[PDB]
Design a protein around this ligand. Structure first.
Ligand SMILES: *[C@@H]1O[C@H](CO)[C@@H](O[C@@H]2O[C@H](CO)[C@@H](O[C@@H]3O[C@H](CO[C@H]4O[C@H](CO)[C@@H](O)[C@H](O)[C@@H]4O)[C@@H](O)[C@H](O[C@H]4O[C@H](CO)[C@@H](O)[C@H](O)[C@@H]4O)[C@@H]3O)[C@H](O)[C@H]2NC(C)=O)[C@H](O)[C@H]1NC(C)=O
Ligand SMILES: *[C@@H]1O[C@H](CO)[C@@H](O[C@@H]2O[C@H](CO)[C@@H](O[C@@H]3O[C@H](CO[C@H]4O[C@H](CO)[C@@H](O)[C@H](O)[C@@H]4O)[C@@H](O)[C@H](O[C@H]4O[C@H](CO)[C@@H](O)[C@H](O)[C@@H]4O)[C@@H]3O)[C@H](O)[C@H]2NC(C)=O)[C@H](O)[C@H]1NC(C)=O
Ligand SMILES: *[C@@H]1O[C@H](CO)[C@@H](O[C@@H]2O[C@H](CO)[C@@H](O[C@@H]3O[C@H](CO[C@H]4O[C@H](CO)[C@@H](O)[C@H](O)[C@@H]4O)[C@@H](O)[C@H](O[C@H]4O[C@H](CO)[C@@H](O)[C@H](O)[C@@H]4O)[C@@H]3O)[C@H](O)[C@H]2NC(C)=O)[C@H](O)[C@H]1NC(C)=O
Ligand SMILES: *[C@@H]1O[C@H](CO)[C@@H](O[C@@H]2O[C@H](CO)[C@@H](O[C@@H]3O[C@H](CO[C@H]4O[C@H](CO)[C@@H](O)[C@H](O)[C@@H]4O)[C@@H](O)[C@H](O[C@H]4O[C@H](CO)[C@@H](O)[C@H](O)[C@@H]4O)[C@@H]3O)[C@H](O)[C@H]2NC(C)=O)[C@H](O)[C@H]1NC(C)=O
Ligand SMILES: *[C@@H]1O[C@H](CO)[C@@H](O[C@@H]2O[C@H](CO)[C@@H](O[C@@H]3O[C@H](CO)[C@@H](O)[C@H](O)[C@@H]3O)[C@H](O)[C@H]2NC(C)=O)[C@H](O)[C@H]1NC(C)=O
Ligand SMILES: *[C@@H]1O[C@H](CO)[C@@H](O[C@@H]2O[C@H](CO)[C@@H](O[C@@H]3O[C@H](CO)[C@@H](O)[C@H](O)[C@@H]3O)[C@H](O)[C@H]2NC(C)=O)[C@H](O)[C@H]1NC(C)=O
Ligand SMILES: CCOCc1nc2c(N)nc3ccccc3c2n1CC(C)(C)O
Ligand SMILES: CCOCc1nc2c(N)nc3ccccc3c2n1CC(C)(C)O
Ligand SMILES: *[C@@H]1O[C@H](CO)[C@@H](O)[C@H](O)[C@H]1NC(C)=O
Ligand SMILES: *[C@@H]1O[C@H](CO)[C@@H](O)[C@H](O)[C@H]1NC(C)=O
Ligand SMILES: *[C@@H]1O[C@H](CO)[C@@H](O)[C@H](O)[C@H]1NC(C)=O
Ligand SMILES: *[C@@H]1O[C@H](CO)[C@@H](O)[C@H](O)[C@H]1NC(C)=O
Ligand SMILES: *[C@@H]1O[C@H](CO)[C@@H](O)[C@H](O)[C@H]1NC(C)=O
Ligand SMILES: *[C@@H]1O[C@H](CO)[C@@H](O)[C@H](O)[C@H]1NC(C)=O
Ligand SMILES: *[C@@H]1O[C@H](CO)[C@@H](O)[C@H](O)[C@H]1NC(C)=O
Ligand SMILES: *[C@@H]1O[C@H](CO)[C@@H](O)[C@H](O)[C@H]1NC(C)=O
Ligand SMILES: *[C@@H]1O[C@H](CO)[C@@H](O)[C@H](O)[C@H]1NC(C)=O
Ligand SMILES: *[C@@H]1O[C@H](CO)[C@@H](O)[C@H](O)[C@H]1NC(C)=O
Ligand SMILES: *[C@@H]1O[C@H](CO)[C@@H](O)[C@H](O)[C@H]1NC(C)=O
Ligand SMILES: *[C@@H]1O[C@H](CO)[C@@H](O)[C@H](O)[C@H]1NC(C)=O
Lengths: 751, 749
């Protein structure tokens, strides 16, 4: 009664089947009859018939995206027997037509990324319960494809349709006879040059309209882009939006706009998000009558409207920006200007809820920082990727014109006001650099090629920084007072500052670490640390997590050198230590015993350990997680229970373990998760996993072992049957390497 | 075929390379004709009379690093070897010098062991010794004993030329050294004092190494023990008075604060003087000793900085003008802020001075015009400063500095070289390079340069032929970039991915077409995936393009036609590196647009599941094709249909499962075929069918999971019948199955 090939998972009172990416040649007939959702994506399935899903009474969702994985044949009426089927994902299946006889019960159908150039009544009109219909990306770029034929009135019978996406197809015109139930209409990149008055006239419920990419701005496009003749603007009739009273979202990115008709927004009192990226609106940004029409606008994106070849001294912001009373975020990337002056952002300064200013990628050379102070509620000052100095490749489910990840890492932003100056050229922080700023909590100085010696005075003007990112610089740690002016500092990321650390002959000082009363997380990764000056030990009463990966503990803990034997011992509060990627072949016993007894989580993965002393776990009574993945370990103790009472997770994947000793699991009651995958186990003896006492083992990973599928595997097979509480994932990847004829088969399948 | 060793005859020598082979004992299958034998890095734990008992022809044995994961040698184990000359026993954890070693020995190496007693019984009867290495037996924080040197132990060694006792605790120079000595290494031996009598007899001495005695310990990257109070080594006035032939003196890290000029009174041929890691800032300023060295060619004064001191200027004595033969001056780690023209006046008088090394000095500013006032200056090494817009240790290498060239020989070969790497010249202004000499070789690597090169930046040094701009942030937004360098031949733009990764900014590589002499171009690791307006790279001159570590997977995406001819315009190209481009497949049209001139094509380390072999028809000059590290499972039936120029095919680290009939005899042009690390059970006779004999030379097959049954017999016969065909490391060509033959070489059955 152990499910195969799928993995069943409890989700919200129901069981779903995860069966994706398992090299399945066809729909498995062993799917649990009670499953409500079935993910069969990324397999090699080529055929779907009315026999594929028999008996699955309560199946509401099927994902068949990407079959076969590098044409899916679906018979007429194949899904008709599934009475509860609501959502059917058929993306990236090379479909030539919409499948015939789709179930009337469908509320969601996705046919994205196929070869469908004809939307017919035979295919669609009978699907009267459809709410969401995705037909995007069937004909686009330089793909060899036909222009899309939309049968007249095909969508007319879809009276519950709320979302229609037709983006990235050749449409030429907005389809007539759209149902008035529509809430979201996606028509991006459809080669529509003209929007008439009758196009959207009857869509009184529309909350989103996407017309982006029609008459695109094609200069420097990272895709094959074809402009309207002459690079003309999209042509939107004066009355084209007169009846869209409920509109909240309007995307007009890359429509080659030079002029925004203010009348378009006359009847849109709820417009909340306006996307105007990749146009030619520098003029409109400066004057902009339309800006007076949007008192409820929360997000305005005007990025990449730069004038080709133009590098003006200043940005020109209309006084009418002051009329955007509800504005929360303003995105002004790729405007391109040399200098940000205080008077230039005047109109923005009285906006009550404006919390985000995004000025990335403007080649700004200099800024008058005191201006941000004159704002009302600024939480995020994003100035990444400028020139500031001292003193299919496109995801069809993502935004096409910008990334959607947060501007600031949420862990950093959570502390408070953020200033992102990453990817600039602040190579030196002088006495006055950070004066007249707001109370910054989150400061990003990553990749500024800063080579200075932090001395303890640089951040004095912003003394309440909690999270400081100084990664990817070339910092010279030659002063024990470095960063000490930041008394409340909790997170310090110093990753990738290896420049000076790798030079044996210069001085290196890390003693400043001990000064902080509140420092919790310190990342020293990829710094090539192998030698320190005078003080060889890291010390801190507060530090909870140290990432020391990508350094040279192999040199630090070299047998002929005693000096670094206690390097981490003074981190009394430490619970997480990452020692991965340190080229470790062995850890001296005395060095290992000098690791903080307070550790709950220890990572030594991706080294070259040929040796591990399991006995030393006796000195780590709080240790819960031990990660030894990706080493060269051959040996497993048979006495683990004598060495730990606390270990919950033991990760041993990608090692050279070929034998599981008798009584390995005996009396280790704490162990919940054992990962032995990608090792050299040929079998598992009865006595290996046997126990008399209580065991809370709930996960055992074994995939990627060269199992011997003779009768010697019978005992473990029996053990699997008697322990269904113990999940073994990727059973299709738990594979017989022998005998010659049983090769490639799952061990779960054997007479 | 030799097993397990790889035996090769080289100019009146026969060498068996048997190293790193997991050997558990000395093989009895060594060829009798073998002279030099390398058994290093195996698991041999025992050496006896029986071990080499069959081999009387051995002149050289290397047993270093055995066993890799202590080596036991019986008394007289090597004694029956009459021709044994060189014996290498390094890193074997030997507790003593092996007893009964053969008197025929001329070189013996006991480096990196546990030997703490140097005795007559072990050494004194080895009369023919020239080179004796005993270094690194007791050092740093190793648990070990003081070295005992039995009185007169070296006295019978009257042919001894080289003696190395470095990194052992000696405390004194051993007495009664043979006068035949040419080189004496005594580094890091805790010798505080040098008397007049210590080197008295050594009339033939050309090298003396006394480094690391009374060391300078501040910031040492090793366990370092200073003399009491950090005092200097104590060298008597007359200590060197008889060292007439000396060419090399190493006094690095001996805590010298003073050099006695009289040390060099009788030393007229001294050539290399090493004074690193001392406290010689004062002597560098005065330096009476500088008058005593007319034939000195190399002088290393690196890392003599005063602790905590950061002076404005370097103080060079006028006496430096007396070093008329000086060729290289090394002044790293002196530490000063500014170099003025007047500070180097004494050096400008030196007729042959060709290298100045000022690395790691934290220099802020340089008056570059000073470099014009040198006649023979060929290397100006200013790497790793602060210039801005205007066991852990190899016992066989130098301990105090790296020995590699300061500047790549390929760069320096063009002429006067200037290395400004690892500085802060983040943009080049109009006057940055004025008053420089005529530079042929320029390194600007790692300067955080983010500027848009515009065609004027290098006008003052227009004859640069090799330009290294790696590891910067260059913004290629101008089509005239670098065009002022008419004679440019090698251009390295590796690791400037900063702006290439941003889609929204413009990217311009059109400048490549403007050079008439550009031969080699390195565009590696730039993450290039989009270009502005011009999608093609063009050059009539370019011979080599390195495009590794970019995004050809995106450039050659199925839905995009724009980059289909990206390399077509490189008409002279013979070598193209497309490695690390995340390629799952290459569009047929894209591959056909690769330059027909190609002789060498690397597509290694991608993710290719497919390769159209027929497309090789359009490459008549193709000789090397590198397809290593992909996912390929399919070879073409008939390869000679598609190529006749192919000399080398590298298919290792793929998923190849069967070899089509006729493959191994198919291509008359093929010499080297690499099938190592694939998925092979056998090579069938079908594949070995021969109308005509193969020109094959090398065939790599190691790492394949061969099944070992009577069906390989047909391949074994082919192995025996073709010996012109070299198949390397047969001990790693190994049966995977069945269990009894598992782990064994296919030649064993
Ligand atoms: C023009 O501008 C308009 C308005 O901004 C853009 O419209 C957005 O389009 C994007 C991309 O299609 C939409 O983002 C996607 O939304 C899907 C629906 O999410 C809804 O429901 C889920 C849960 O049911 C909620 O969590 C969510 O808040 C919504 O209520 C998501 O399923 C998508 O996420 C999935 O895919 C992404 C990308 O692979 C993964 O990262 C996720 O993990 C997940 O698997 C995705 O978030 C967005 O909803 C649209 N906005 C609105 C308001 O509808 C246009 O994209 C833009 N035009 C172009 C061409 O750029
Ligand atoms: C220098 O080193 C530091 C310290 O390690 C790194 O910063 C940490 O980065 C890790 C990721 O590697 C962060 O851990 C992840 O954080 C996410 C936090 O999500 C928050 O909100 C969610 C709900 O949305 C909550 O569940 C959660 O409590 C948080 O409040 C999690 O989503 C992640 O969990 C997922 O992945 C991990 C494996 O990576 C699994 O363990 C989880 O089960 C789950 O699958 C994860 O926890 C961590 O928060 C960062 N710490 C800080 C202080 O920022 C730096 O990235 C590193 N610098 C460099 C350059 O590498
Ligand atoms: C104090 O200063 C003195 C004077 O400079 C230093 O003396 C040098 O010491 C180094 C390091 O031991 C010597 O370098 C080694 O020389 C060996 C001898 O090679 C000679 O003969 C070979 C032919 O076999 C010639 O090719 C060569 O030109 C020489 O004539 C080499 O065999 C060594 O190379 C081997 O090991 C290295 C490193 O692993 C590899 O790179 C090579 O591939 C090779 O396998 C090595 O180069 C040097 O000879 C000494 N100088 C002189 C003139 O004798 C002291 O080292 C220094 N003290 C300290 C402690 O630094
Ligand atoms: C950007 O890309 C460029 C161009 O590829 C790189 O520059 C080249 O780097 C390679 C090293 O990978 C250099 O090739 C090497 O040259 C050495 C010097 O050759 C001299 O001596 C040989 C024989 O004595 C002569 O044939 C030659 O004329 C020279 O006089 C060789 O010793 C090396 O040989 C090694 O490889 C070959 C097989 O390829 C073997 O036969 C050898 O046994 C040995 O293993 C090698 O050929 C090359 O010289 C460089 N070219 C230039 C113009 O500098 C840059 O490194 C790269 N930049 C970055 C950052 O990666
Ligand atoms: C400080 O600024 C730097 C530079 O902008 C920020 O680095 C960027 O961080 C983001 C978020 O982690 C990275 O994007 C992510 O990459 C991962 C792995 O590729 C991907 O899985 C995510 O979906 C996301 O795309 C981005 O690569 C990185 N940029 C660079 C050049 O390093 C950093 O986050 C900032 N730090 C703080 C505290 O905000
Ligand atoms: C310009 O300056 C840069 C920075 O100094 C030079 O880079 C350095 O190049 C040397 C020579 O290749 C590297 O040393 C070598 O490394 C290889 C690979 O690890 C090793 O096999 C060799 O034995 C040798 O140690 C060195 O790592 C590298 N330094 C850095 C920081 O990249 C560059 O060579 C200079 N260019 C020219 C043309 O002189
Ligand atoms: C050859 C270097 O010896 C030690 C050293 N390390 C550093 C360092 N990490 N940074 C420095 C920054 C400015 C000036 C001097 C130094 C410096 N220095 C020089 C000095 C100030 C004399 O210690
Ligand atoms: C969002 C930018 O779009 C195009 C662009 N690319 C670059 C570039 N690679 N570098 C620049 C350097 C200085 C000033 C402007 C630019 C620039 N610019 C701006 C402009 C001068 C208008 O082309
Ligand atoms: C479908 O769901 C019902 C509960 O609504 C459940 O009783 C029934 O067993 C399920 N059918 C199958 C075949 O599992
Ligand atoms: C500002 O935001 C708050 C909620 O965060 C909202 O209640 C208020 O109406 C907003 N003010 C304006 C001017 O829209
Ligand atoms: C660190 O730098 C400050 C400011 O330059 C200086 O006052 C202090 O002496 C330095 N601390 C040291 C040398 O450890
Ligand atoms: C140790 O870490 C815990 C959890 O982060 C924290 O509450 C405590 O303040 C730390 N101890 C000290 C002494 O800072
Ligand atoms: C493991 O550690 C213990 C010290 O607790 C030591 O006695 C034992 O020798 C170690 N095992 C090995 C083989 O290093
Ligand atoms: C060395 O090898 C001999 C066998 O020739 C053995 O008898 C002796 O015990 C070994 N000595 C040591 C200490 O290993
Ligand atoms: C040593 O040198 C002096 C000359 O400086 C000479 O008188 C004496 O004979 C020499 N001794 C030897 C051993 O040659
Ligand atoms: C300088 O080197 C040249 C060889 O190019 C040589 O003729 C001359 O003797 C050298 N001069 C001195 C003073 O060593
Ligand atoms: C140039 O070098 C000569 C020695 O050849 C020296 O006498 C003179 O002072 C130098 N001139 C300058 C301007 O440094
Ligand atoms: C490149 O830069 C130079 C100097 O600014 C300028 O004159 C020229 O117009 C530029 N070339 C272009 C934009 O192609
Ligand atoms: C082709 O390359 C070689 C250099 O390897 C050169 O001799 C020849 O001039 C090049 N062809 C042209 C047109 O530059
Ligand atoms: C290989 O390329 C040739 C074009 O010359 C084409 O005819 C053939 O179909 C291609 N083979 C494959 C499998 O793509």
């Amino acid at each position: 009664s152990r499910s195969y090939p799928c993995d069943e998972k409890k989700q919200n009172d129901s069981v779903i089947a995860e069966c994706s990416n398992r090299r399945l040649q066809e729909v498995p007939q062993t799917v649990g009859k009670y499953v409500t959702e079935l993910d069969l994506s990324d397999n090699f399935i080529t055929h779907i018939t009315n026999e594929s899903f028999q008996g699955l009474q309560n199946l509401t969702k099927i994902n068949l995206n990407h079959n076969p994985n590098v044409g899916l044949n679906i018979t007429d009426g194949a899904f008709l027997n599934l009475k509860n089927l609501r959502e059917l994902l058929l993306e990236d299946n090379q479909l030539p037509q919409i499948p015939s006889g789709l179930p009337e019960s469908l509320t969601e159908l996705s046919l994205i990324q196929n070869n469908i150039y004809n939307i017919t009544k035979e295919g669609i009109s009978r699907l009267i319960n459809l709410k969401n219909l995705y037909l995007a990306w069937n004909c686009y770029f330089n793909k060899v494809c036909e222009k899309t034929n939309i049968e007249d009135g095909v969508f007319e019978t879809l009276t519950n349709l709320e979302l229609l996406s037709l983006s990235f197809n050749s449409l030429s015109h907005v389809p007539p006879k759209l149902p008035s139930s529509l809430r979201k209409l996606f028509l991006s990149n459809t080669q529509i040059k003209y929007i008439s008055e009758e196009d959207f006239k009857g869509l009184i419920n529309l909350t989103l309209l996407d017309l982006s990419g029609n008459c695109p701005r094609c200069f420097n496009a990272p895709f094959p882009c074809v402009p309207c003749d002459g690079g003309a603007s999209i042509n939107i009739d004066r009355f084209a939006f007169q009846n869209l009273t409920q509109l909240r979202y309007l995307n007009l990115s890359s429509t080659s706009l030079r002029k925004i008709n203010a009348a378009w927004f006359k009847n849109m009192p709820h417009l909340k998000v306006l996307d105007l990226e990749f146009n030619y609106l520098v003029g409109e940004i400066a004057s902009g009558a339309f800006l007076t029409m949007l008192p409820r606008l929360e997000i305005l994106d005007l990025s990449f409207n730069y004038i080709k070849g133009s590098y003006p001294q200043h940005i020109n912001i209309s006084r009418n920006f002051s009329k955007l009373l509800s504005l929360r975020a303003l995105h002004l990337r790729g405007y391109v200007f040399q200098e940000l002056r205080e008077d230039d952002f005047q109109p923005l300064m009285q906006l009550p809820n404006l919390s985000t200013i995004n000025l990335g990628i403007n080649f700004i050379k200099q800024i008058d920082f005191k201006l941000f102070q004159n704002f009302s509620n600024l939480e995020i000052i994003y100035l990444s990727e400028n020139r500031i100095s001292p003193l299919f490749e496109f995801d069809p489910h993502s935004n096409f014109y910008h990334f959607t990840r947060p501007l600031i890492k949420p862990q950093c932003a959570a502390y408070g006001k953020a200033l992102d100056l990453s990817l600039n050229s602040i190579f030196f922080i002088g006495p006055n650099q950070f004066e007249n700023l707001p109370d910054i909590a989150c400061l990003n100085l990553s990749a500024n090629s800063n080579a200075q010696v932090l001395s303890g005075t640089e951040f004095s003007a912003i003394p309440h920084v909690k999270y400081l990112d100084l990664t990817n610089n070339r910092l010279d740690f030659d002063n024990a007072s470095a960063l000490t002016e930041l008394s409340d500092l909790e997170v310090l990321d110093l990753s990738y500052n290896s420049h000076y650390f790798r030079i044996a002959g210069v001085t290196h000082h890390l003693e400043f670490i001990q000064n902080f009363t509140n420092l919790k997380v310190l990342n020293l990764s990829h710094n090539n640390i192998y030698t320190l000056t005078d003080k060889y030990n890291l010390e801190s009463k507060s530090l909870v997590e140290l990432v020391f990966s990508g350094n040279r503990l192999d040199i630090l803990w070299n047998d002929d050198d005693n000096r670094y034997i206690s390097i981490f011992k003074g981190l009394k509060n430490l619970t997480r230590l990452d020692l991965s990627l340190n080229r470790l072949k062995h850890i001296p016993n005395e060095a290992f015993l000098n690791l903080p007894a307070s550790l709950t989580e220890l990572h030594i993965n991706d080294n070259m350990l040929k040796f591990f002393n399991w006995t030393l776990l006796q000195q780590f009574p709080r240790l819960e997680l031990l990660d030894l993945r990706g080493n060269k370990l051959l040996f497993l103790t048979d006495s683990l229970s004598d060495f730990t009472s606390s270990l919950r997770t033991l990760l041993l994947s990608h090692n050279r373990i070929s034998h599981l000793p008798s009584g390995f699991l005996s009396e280790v009651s704490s162990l919940k998760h054992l990962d032995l995958s990608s090792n050299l186990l040929k079998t598992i003896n009865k006595s290996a996993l046997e126990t008399k006492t209580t065991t809370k083992l709930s996960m055992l990973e074994l995939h990627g072992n060269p199992f011997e599928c003779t009768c010697d595997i019978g005992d473990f097979r029996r053990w699997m049957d008697e322990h269904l509480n113990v999940k073994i994932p990727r059973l299709v990847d738990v594979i017989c390497a022998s005998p010659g004829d049983q090769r490639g088969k799952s061990i779960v399948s054997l007479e």
